[PDB]
Design an enzyme around this catalytic site. Structure first.
Site, mmCIF file in Angstrom:
data_model
loop_
_atom_site.group_PDB
_atom_site.id
_atom_site.type_symbol
_atom_site.label_atom_id
_atom_site.label_comp_id
_atom_site.label_asym_id
_atom_site.label_seq_id
_atom_site.Cartn_x
_atom_site.Cartn_y
_atom_site.Cartn_z
ATOM 1 N N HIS A 16 -7.045 0.011 -0.303
ATOM 2 C CA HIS A 16 -6.970 -0.939 0.957
ATOM 3 C C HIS A 16 -7.990 -1.790 1.942
ATOM 4 O O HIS A 16 -7.841 -2.556 1.800
ATOM 5 C CB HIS A 16 -5.787 -0.649 2.144
ATOM 6 C CG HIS A 16 -5.852 0.460 2.792
ATOM 7 N ND1 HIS A 16 -5.830 1.345 3.095
ATOM 8 C CD2 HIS A 16 -6.858 -0.299 4.331
ATOM 9 C CE1 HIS A 16 -6.623 2.273 4.026
ATOM 10 N NE2 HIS A 16 -6.688 1.260 4.828
ATOM 11 N N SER A 58 -9.972 4.911 7.799
ATOM 12 C CA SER A 58 -9.815 4.127 6.514
ATOM 13 C C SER A 58 -10.133 4.468 5.726
ATOM 14 O O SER A 58 -11.672 4.296 5.580
ATOM 15 C CB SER A 58 -9.355 2.577 6.680
ATOM 16 O OG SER A 58 -8.160 2.574 7.556
ATOM 17 N N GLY A 59 -10.222 5.407 3.975
ATOM 18 C CA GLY A 59 -10.640 5.959 3.283
ATOM 19 C C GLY A 59 -11.881 6.788 3.380
ATOM 20 O O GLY A 59 -12.708 7.633 2.131
ATOM 21 N N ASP A 79 -3.753 4.170 -2.663
ATOM 22 C CA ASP A 79 -4.858 3.500 -2.373
ATOM 23 C C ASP A 79 -5.802 5.080 -3.005
ATOM 24 O O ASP A 79 -6.248 5.960 -1.723
ATOM 25 C CB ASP A 79 -3.783 4.012 -0.898
ATOM 26 C CG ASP A 79 -5.125 3.194 -0.070
ATOM 27 O OD1 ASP A 79 -6.281 2.700 -0.187
ATOM 28 O OD2 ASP A 79 -4.138 3.210 1.436
ATOM 29 N N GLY A 82 -10.088 2.090 11.266
ATOM 30 C CA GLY A 82 -11.469 2.455 11.257
ATOM 31 C C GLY A 82 -12.159 4.197 10.368
ATOM 32 O O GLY A 82 -12.713 3.308 10.117
#
Ligand code: 7SD
Ligand code: NAG
Ligand code: NAG
Length: 588
Positions: free
Chosen positions: A398, A538-539, A447, A536
């Protein structure tokens, strides 16, 4: 092969090659890893045994079979060296021990505001190996072999090791070698090396070595040829230097941040024989095969590939696998048909391996963490990511929703403070993006995405990969899982400048389903939860510490708010994408 498992309440019987005091078992394993002969270790906490002088006791062991009788003993921790474990090999150990006094030669005493201030003074003092802080004077210390001469439990004392081998020393790094120049000072050890750089690398990883003098094979005195003299002094720098034909001097490189040599010697030496104890001999096809043969046989330390016609059959010649007491040849002879070399078992530059409510992290603490930024009208940090290989980063799909996945992305690694990023800060660019096939921009499934960098990264102690999980073997219930990032510290907060860390308990896949009745929490997702990943982050990584080791369990994906009561974070569960990972990633 690499063997990371530990054995609880277990002591290995016999096979001792060395013993010392160490503050915990992983420190002892590191000693095992770097010892030339240690395959196995047993460590005894202060509670386990009642013989005072055995407490904090670290016993290093060898065995010709690779195994030893195992005896039950409550609290004893046994395990293996990390020889052959690649980038998991590391001389760095930043743990601070509360209530523990590690003793040695007290050579420097100061008054500082915090334990941290003490650790820093130790780290910046060329002579400091470990320290103790009371509660506020600060004691810097060295000892025979760099381990404490005693370790006692004292409630208001904290101790730890110099962070020099974690690349945090402000002491300079000296790449200079000096031709025809000898040092004197205090000889701490003596070994044979084929050249000066091998000798310098041995000096770098030797506890009490700060500089060296190497004697070439053209050296006047024949009996001293190839002698590598490891040295030190009180000041820490040579107190004299004598011009001397056929003599090469230099310094330990342990303080070096980006030129720290690998603790293995990977050059091949034609026309030289390396003497030692013979371990095994087999007919392989060429020197390289012989070197791999040595690297795979863990007790092998070095080899000679013979080229005499008498030692060859047909494309295949004798490969002499050998070892010695200290890891160096017992003899080096220069007029031979064939080539010699070392085992690569200890090479650690790799081939891929198998925030709301947190606190500041410390430089290099999380060396796999990367920041994914986008140069749009401005440059901004959007996502975390996990380094998993020289060229590969694992993050969330994403992160690229509707984003121009072109020359816009800049990956930052080995960085703690985002504010430090200028347009001259080095960065990785994306060579290719691998969004999961079954990912869809409006849905949370799959994801996950890979990023091949345009150039491979060099592994350092502040920049190196996290290990992934073994198979689908997540039956193991991780207890020590952490999540990092520069994301929002609150719901509707801001990006943080200092990489953040938080300890979050994992949740069950049905309990997590019970709290998100509108979405479908799947097998390929793992959940964990006032403390949470946020926008922020994320990942970024969800890491769990198993057998003292770190595993990559989840990729920060999603949550409803941030740190909301009984609504836990949803992470892509890495175990369940290894197939695709190894697939897309072991090709091109
Ligand atoms: C906002 C946020 C709060 C939090 N506690 N933590 C994180 C990291 C974030 C940032 N996240 C995103 O900005 C984002 C946008 N899109 N995505 C993919 C996705 C996955 C899952 C769902 C719902 N779902 C769950 C199971 C099935 N579907 C929806 C979107 C992630
Ligand atoms: C800034 C500086 O040079 N500080 C040093 C300190 O590290 C050392 O421990 C002490 C020796 O007594 O001398 C001073
Ligand atoms: C001047 C100031 O407040 N600096 C703080 C520092 O004290 C703190 O440790 C860090 C987050 O932990 O954020 C910054």
């Amino acid at each position: 092969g690499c063997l990371t498992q530990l054995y609880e309440n277990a002591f290995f019987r016999g096979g001792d090659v060395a013993s010392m005091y160490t503050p915990n078992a992983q420190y002892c394993q590191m000693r095992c890893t770097f010892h030339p002969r240690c395959l196995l270790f047993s460590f005894l906490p202060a509670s386990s045994i009642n013989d005072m002088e055995k407490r904090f006791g670290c016993f290093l062991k060898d065995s010709v079979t690779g195994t030893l009788p195992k005896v039950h003993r409550t609290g004893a921790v046994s395990g293996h060296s990390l020889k052959q474990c690649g980038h998991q090999i590391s001389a760095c150990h930043r743990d601070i021990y509360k209530g523990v006094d590690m003793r040695g030669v007290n050579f420097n005493v100061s008054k500082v505001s915090s334990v941290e201030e003490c650790q820093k003074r130790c780290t910046n003092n060329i002579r400091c190996q470990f320290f103790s802080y009371a509660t506020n004077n600060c004691l810097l210390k060295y000892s025979p072999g760099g381990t404490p001469t005693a370790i006692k439990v004292l409630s208001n004392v904290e101790s730890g090791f110099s962070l020099k081998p974690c690349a945090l020393s402000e002491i300079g790094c000296h790449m200079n070698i000096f031709q025809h120049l000898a040092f004197s000072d205090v000889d701490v050890a003596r070994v044979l090396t084929p050249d000066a750089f091998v000798c310098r690398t041995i000096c770098t990883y030797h506890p009490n070595c700060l500089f060296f003098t190497f004697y070439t094979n053209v050296w006047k005195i024949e009996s001293q040829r190839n002698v590598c003299l490891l040295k030190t002094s009180e000041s820490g720098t040579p107190s004299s230097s004598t011009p001397q034909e056929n003599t090469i001097s230099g310094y330990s490189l342990l303080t070096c941040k980006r030129t720290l040599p690998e603790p293995c010697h990977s050059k091949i030496y034609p026309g030289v024989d390396f003497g030692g104890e013979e371990l095994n001999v087999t007919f392989v096809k060429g020197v390289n095969v012989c070197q791999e043969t040595c690297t795979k046989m863990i007790r092998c330390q070095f080899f000679t590939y013979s080229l005499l016609p008498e030692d060859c059959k047909e494309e295949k010649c004798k490969c002499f696998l050998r070892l010695s007491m200290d890891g160096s040849p017992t003899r080096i002879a220069y007029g031979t048909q064939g080539s010699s070399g070392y085992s690569l078992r200890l090479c650690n530059t790799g081939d891929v391996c198998t925030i709301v409510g947190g606190t500041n992290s410390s430089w290099g603490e999380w060396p796999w963490q990367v920041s994914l930024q986008v140069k749009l009208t401005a440059q901004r940090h959007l996502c975390g990511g996990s380094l998993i290989g020289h060229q590969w980063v694992l993050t969330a799909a994403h992160c690229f929703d509707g984003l121009p996945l072109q020359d816009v992305w800049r990956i930052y690694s080995g960085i703690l403070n985002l504010s430090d990023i200028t347009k001259d800060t080095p960065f990785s660019q994306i060579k290719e993006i691998i969004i999961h096939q079954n990912y869809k921009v409006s849905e949370g499934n799959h994801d996950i995405a890979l990023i091949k960098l345009q150039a491979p990264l060099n592994y350092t102690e502040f920049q190196k990969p996290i290990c992934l999980p073994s198979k689908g073997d997540t039956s193991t219930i991780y207890t020590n899982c952490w999540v990092t990032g520069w994301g929002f510290s609150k719901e509707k907060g801001e990006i943080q400048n200092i990489l953040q860390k938080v300890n979050i308990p994992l949740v069950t896949n049905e309990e997590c389903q019970k709290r998100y009745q509108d979405y479908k929490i799947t097998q390929r997702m793992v959940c964990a939860g006032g403390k949470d990943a946020c926008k922020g982050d994320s990942g970024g990584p969800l890491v769990c510490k198993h057998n003292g080791m770190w595993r990559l369990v989840g990729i920060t994906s999603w949550g409803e708010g941030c740190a909301r009561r009984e609504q836990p974070g949803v992470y892509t569960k890495v175990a369940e994408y290894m197939d695709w990972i190894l697939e897309k990633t072991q090709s091109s």
